[PDB]
């Protein structure tokens, strides 16, 4: 969706409405940080 290459037409209107990246204490939110670095300057904030 951040690349916005195909969300508008080929797939239905909008990309999937959300992500729940859960899991036991471990890899959780590290993939989020990796996605943040791989994406544009619209970068995440870690709220508790």
Ligand X SMILES: Nc1ncnc2c1ncn2[C@@H]1O[C@H](COP(=O)(O)OP(=O)(O)OP(=O)(O)O)[C@@H](O)[C@H]1O
18/45 Cα distance (integer angstroms): 16
Q: How many CA atoms lie within 13 A of 36 on its CB side?
A: 10
> At closest approach, how far in Å is the CB of 40 from ligand X?
21
Asked if 11 contacts 17 with a C-beta cutoff of 8 angstroms, the reply is no
Partner interacting with residue 11 (select from another protein, ligand X, none; CB below 5-8 Å by kind) = another protein
Partner interacting with residue 1 (select from ligand X, another protein, none; CB below 5-8 Å by kind) = none
Q: Which positions lie near another protein, rule CB under 8 A?
A: 6, 10-13, 16-17
Verify binding: residue 29, ligand X, rule CB under 6 A: yes
């Amino acid at each position: 969706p951040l690349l916005h290459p195909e969300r508008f037409v080929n797939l239905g209107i909008e990309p999937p409405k959300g992500v729940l990246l859960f899991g036991p204490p471990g890899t959780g939110k590290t993939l989020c940080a990796r996605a943040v670095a791989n994406r544009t300057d619209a970068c995440f904030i870690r709220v508790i």
